[PDB]
Amino acid sequence: DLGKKLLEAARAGQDDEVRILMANGADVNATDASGLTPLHLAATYGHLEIVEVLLKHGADVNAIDIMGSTPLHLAALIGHLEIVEVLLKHGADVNAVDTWGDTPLHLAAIMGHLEIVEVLLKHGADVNAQDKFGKTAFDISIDNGNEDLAEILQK
Amino acid sequence: MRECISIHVGQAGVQIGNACWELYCLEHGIQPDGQMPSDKTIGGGDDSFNTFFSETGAGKHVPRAVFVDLEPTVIDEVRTGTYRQLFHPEQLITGKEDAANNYARGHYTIGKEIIDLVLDRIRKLADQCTGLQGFLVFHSFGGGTGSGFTSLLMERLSVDYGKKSKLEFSIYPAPQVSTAVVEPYNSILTTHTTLEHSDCAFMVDNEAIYDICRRNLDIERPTYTNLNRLISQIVSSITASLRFDGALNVDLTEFQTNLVPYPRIHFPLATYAPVISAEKAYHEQLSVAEITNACFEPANQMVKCDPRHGKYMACCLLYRGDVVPKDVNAAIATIKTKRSIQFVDWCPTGFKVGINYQPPTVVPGGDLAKVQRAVCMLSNTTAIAEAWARLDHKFDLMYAKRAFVHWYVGEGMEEGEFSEAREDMAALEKDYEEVG
Amino acid sequence: MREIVHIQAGQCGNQIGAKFWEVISDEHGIDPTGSYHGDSDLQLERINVYYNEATGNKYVPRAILVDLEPGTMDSVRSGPFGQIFRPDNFVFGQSGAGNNWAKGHYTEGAELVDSVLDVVRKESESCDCLQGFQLTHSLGGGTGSGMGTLLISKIREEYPDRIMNTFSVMPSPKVSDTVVEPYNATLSVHQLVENTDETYCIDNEALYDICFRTLKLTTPTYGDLNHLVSATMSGVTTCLRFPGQLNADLRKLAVNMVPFPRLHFFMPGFAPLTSRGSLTVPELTQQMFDSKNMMAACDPRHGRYLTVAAIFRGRMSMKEVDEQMLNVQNKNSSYFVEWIPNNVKTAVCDIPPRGLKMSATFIGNSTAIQELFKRISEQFTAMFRRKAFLHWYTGEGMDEMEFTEAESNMNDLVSEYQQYQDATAD
Ligand SMILES: Nc1nc2c(ncn2[C@@H]2O[C@H](COP(=O)(O)OP(=O)(O)OP(=O)(O)O)[C@@H](O)[C@H]2O)c(=O)[nH]1
Ligand SMILES: Nc1nc2c(ncn2[C@@H]2O[C@H](COP(=O)(O)OP(=O)(O)OP(=O)(O)O)[C@@H](O)[C@H]2O)c(=O)[nH]1
Ligand SMILES: COc1ccc(/N=N/c2cc(OC)c(OC)c(OC)c2)cc1O
Numbered sequence A: 001d002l003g004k005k006l007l008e009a010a011r012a013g014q015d016d017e018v019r020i021l022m023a024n025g026a027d028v029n030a031t032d033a034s035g036l037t038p039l040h041l042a043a044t045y046g047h048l049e050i051v052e053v054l055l056k057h058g059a060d061v062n063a064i065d066i067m068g069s070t071p072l073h074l075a076a077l078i079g080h081l082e083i084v085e086v087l088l089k090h091g092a093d094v095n096a097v098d099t100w101g102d103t104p105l106h107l108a109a110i111m112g113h114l115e116i117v118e119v120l121l122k123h124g125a126d127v128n129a130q131d132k133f134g135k136t137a138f139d140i141s142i143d144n145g146n147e148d149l150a151e152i153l154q155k
Numbered sequence B: 001m002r003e004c005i006s007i008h009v010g011q012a013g014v015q016i017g018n019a020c021w022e023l024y025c026l027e028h029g030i031q032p033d034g035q036m037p038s039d040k041t042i043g044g045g046d047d048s049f050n051t052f053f054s055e056t057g058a059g060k061h062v063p064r065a066v067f068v069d070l071e072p073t074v075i076d077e078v079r080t081g082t083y084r085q086l087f088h089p090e091q092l093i094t095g096k097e098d099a100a101n102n103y104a105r106g107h108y109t110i111g112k113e114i115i116d117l118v119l120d121r122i123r124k125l126a127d128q129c130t131g132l133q134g135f136l137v138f139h140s141f142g143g144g145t146g147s148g149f150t151s152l153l154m155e156r157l158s159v160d161y162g163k164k165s166k167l168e169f170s171i172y173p174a175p176q177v178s179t180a181v182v183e184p185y186n187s188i189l190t191t192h193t194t195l196e197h198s199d200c201a202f203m204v205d206n207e208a209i210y211d212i213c214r215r216n217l218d219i220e221r222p223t224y225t226n227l228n229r230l231i232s233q234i235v236s237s238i239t240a241s242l243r244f245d246g247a248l249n250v251d252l253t254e255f256q257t258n259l260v261p262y263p264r265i266h267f268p269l270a271t272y273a274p275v276i277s278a279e280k281a282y283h284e285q286l287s288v289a290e291i292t293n294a295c296f297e298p299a300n301q302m303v304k305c306d307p308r309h310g311k312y313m314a315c316c317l318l319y320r321g322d323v324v325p326k327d328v329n330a331a332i333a334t335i336k337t338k339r340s341i342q343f344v345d346w347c348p349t350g351f352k353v354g355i356n357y358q359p360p361t362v363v364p365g366g367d368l369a370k371v372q373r374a375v376c377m378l379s380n381t382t383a384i385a386e387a388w389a390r391l392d393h394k395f396d397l398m399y400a401k402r403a404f405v406h407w408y409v410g411e412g413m414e415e416g417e418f419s420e421a422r423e424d425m426a427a428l429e430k431d432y433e434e435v436g
Numbered sequence C: 001m002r003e004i005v006h007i008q009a010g011q012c013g014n015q016i017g018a019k020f021w022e023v024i025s026d027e028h029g030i031d032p033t034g035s036y037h038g039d040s041d042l043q044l045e046r047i048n049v050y051y052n053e054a055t056g057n058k059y060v061p062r063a064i065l066v067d068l069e070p071g072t073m074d075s076v077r078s079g080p081f082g083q084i085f086r087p088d089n090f091v092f093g094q095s096g097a098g099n100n101w102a103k104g105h106y107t108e109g110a111e112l113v114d115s116v117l118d119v120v121r122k123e124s125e126s127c128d129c130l131q132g133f134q135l136t137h138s139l140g141g142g143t144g145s146g147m148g149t150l151l152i153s154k155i156r157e158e159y160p161d162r163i164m165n166t167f168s169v170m171p172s173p174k175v176s177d178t179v180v181e182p183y184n185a186t187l188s189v190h191q192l193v194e195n196t197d198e199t200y201c202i203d204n205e206a207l208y209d210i211c212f213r214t215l216k217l218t219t220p221t222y223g224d225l226n227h228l229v230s231a232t233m234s235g236v237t238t239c240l241r242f243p244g245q246l247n248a249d250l251r252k253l254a255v256n257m258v259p260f261p262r263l264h265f266f267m268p269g270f271a272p273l274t275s276r277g278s279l280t281v282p283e284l285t286q287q288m289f290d291s292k293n294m295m296a297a298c299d300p301r302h303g304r305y306l307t308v309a310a311i312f313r314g315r316m317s318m319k320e321v322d323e324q325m326l327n328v329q330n331k332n333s334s335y336f337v338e339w340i341p342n343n344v345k346t347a348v349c350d351i352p353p354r355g356l357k358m359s360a361t362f363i364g365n366s367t368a369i370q371e372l373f374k375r376i377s378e379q380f381t382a383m384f385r386r387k388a389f390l391h392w393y394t395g396e397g398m399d400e401m402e403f404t405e406a407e408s409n410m411n412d413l414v415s416e417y418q419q420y421q422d423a424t425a426d
């Protein structure tokens, strides 16, 4: 089962192994038990070169796991700016919503990734998107007293 | 001559004790080394000053007193001060770690490490007495040692000295100079546990003494030194009858007979006049009528309360100095023609009078001017219940949320002891209401 | 109650710890070699609280220095007062924790904990009357957070009657953008609620905000943040180190500041705020109670003070301090609970700190600290919902339920603050 080995290589950052597995028929869109694909794992663990390779070999840039997380949600949560940009250039849905009502904008605002917040806003992230509790990214900035983030959201 | 033993517990009891024994030495003509040139009998005697001072074969006059504290800082000041040679070194007992403003630490955990030593040292002083009448106990309500250790000590003294009288001088807390937020808790816990063990207790309200220092003595921000010198003046006036010849309050039993109609309402109010600043050395001398009227003004009381709101059960007037007895009689007669002095219907409306014809002594360095006549009034009035209500209210505000309670429970005390203490105070408040 | 045994663990713990020793040694007239070059007798009266007296009248700090990273010992040693520490008191492992709380608490850290305890025993047995302990550490890393909490628990078992006090540095993505820091801080807060008597909450968010917005520093460094930390640590330890009209100790501070056992997290404050290499009583009382001067990023005007202790340093009228402190409590009356009478305590110390004539330090137990705990909780929950990096913890023998338990305890702590913020006297 090359799909299982491709999941492990994407998470571990083994570029050579990813190319080899793809060349031998490995499923680029294989999923683990929770619906995570090689693209979700490479984006979570910050392997930029693997993200680009998978995207040029049929990876679904908008795949969702069982919790509705896309690779963009994970990249924005962990704070990988360069991966966020590659995902957006390849058609990632900037306003994708997970099972908690969170968009990538919400996750980048929560974790204080201000540069990622700016990138998302420049790509059309919705400031009026509410999570399951009714909070927008601006509400989060106000409730936590993050003046730096609140200024960015007003720009 | 029947001996009295003074016991000073915790910082407040110790610092006030130091100031009192300094004043007693100046009144009796005793030097800081213990020598008394006016004492013709060397090695002993049956004079009135012998109630508070024992004598050695070398002519040294030693206070019948014990100083106890759970930490050593304050007592170390006595060990190295002006009167360092006056006290019996074994008479100054210190632990290593204090009660951290916690009644439970003073009573149940830290206090138990030294209680037996304190009792053995008191026993050694009692053994030197021919006719011990009892104890004078000095302590704060608010400190952990002053509250908790005093309660433990009063419980033990009741077992080992059953027929002896016990009188307290207690420092009631004030916000202006307090140490801890939990002082209302400590105050109620010690009051509850000592009530059945004390025959008479003189409360000194730190706020009353603070206001007298500010108003009468022009002291902008009074310190403990200023408060203690005024308190020692008042304590000396109260104990003078025990130390000198006289016809009023001549022994501890008489304080109970004269001032305590029922065992639980044993808290007399003390009033003192005149208090005049030392910077007014040439002040006009106040008459017997002026100083006597001054005892009925709330501003001169040792406890903040309004005697116009209550009824009297007893009233004693203790004069010191140039006081003609017929002038006291005329001054009292004028007081009886005032509607704001009401006695309970079951007590004779009389005033008891004692006169000592020696004027009060001033301490060098003190804040008081010399006066030719002074008076201390001791009264048992129901208006002192106002002091208890004020303390009870501060206790209720915290206790309703159980704030700070965990510190007491963590030091071997049951939570129910707080409710049992508060209930005893509610009954004490009702005892004053039942009298009037 | 005299001696305190100080422990500093991990990088943050040792950096802020070294700065503490440099600042207070200068106040007590102690030079980097251990000699007393002061002039005031007030500097040696309570020197024994932090220093052991040694041969040739040499004063050595009662300090234990711990870290899984051996490189930390060298940075400490290369400092000005790096040679004043006792060489036997340095306990250092071979490999760091890599910001993994589970390595600090269960694996690498657990192997090195018996060695540290041996040094603590040696220091404690040489105390006439030990008060308790003070630990400096960050909650965001792996050593100060994971190993620090393990050390607190082991010390607690051996000395249950002594006070445990921490200076705990809270993480912020404004200073360190490491996404596993909310996990490490939440797991640590769960331990601190149970095992410490008093914790000073020093928040990197507030430290950064003060440098950036108030001090106009565009790129604040650790040195700039630690200047605010050392001034705060000097201020809150003033009455343990100088005589004053109070005989303060760690247990009297706890009994009077902590009305409920879990609510022992203090918000420290300081005035005036100054930058490296760069005042009246009413202004000091004002600044002291302002959100911009708090070392925890919480607005005290969003909650209520349960208790407050203030320390003024320098020459000033003690009557003026009483008047201004009385004034602040009347005009800001709705920001204090009504059911704890006389909940504000002041002390005046004659000796001011270095470079200042006047200074005020604030120690608040305020319900507004729930804002700090909610900020960390929201970040913990964002990571935890996606199970991001959880294997890094479970791979060291940690159960997943330890995370759920820590999250639940922190949310319970927030609810407890809200309960007393809404309580009335009636
Ligand atoms: N008048 C007067 N009050 C004092 C003095 N010293 C302390 N107090 C008051 O006593 C209370 C504090 O109790 P302390 O006597 O200091 O405490 P302690 O008995 O030594 O108990 P711990 O220190 O808690 O073990 C407060 O209400 C103080 O204002 C003093 O010399 N004179
Ligand atoms: N204020 C301040 N924060 C610091 C300092 N050094 C590190 N930090 C913070 O501490 C956290 C990281 O903890 P460290 O002390 O570096 O880690 P550690 O305890 O050594 O743990 P490991 O390196 O994982 O073994 C982050 O939140 C940093 O921002 C410092 O000197 N001052
Ligand atoms: C709310 O009531 C109170 C609160 C705290 C009290 N005093 N606590 C201290 C202890 C200290 O030792 C560290 C201080 O040093 C920092 C200290 O500096 C002023 C005060 C006493 C209280 O009645």
Ligand SMILES: [Ca+2]
Residues within 6 Å of the ligand: B039, B040, B041, B042, B043, B044, B045, B046, B055
């Ligand atoms: Ca004789």
Ligand SMILES: [Mg+2]
Residues within 6 Å of the ligand: B010, B011, B071, B098, B143, B145
């Ligand atoms: Mg004391």
Ligand SMILES: [Mg+2]
Residues within 6 Å of the ligand: C010, C011, C069, C096, C097, C141, C143
């Ligand atoms: Mg480190």
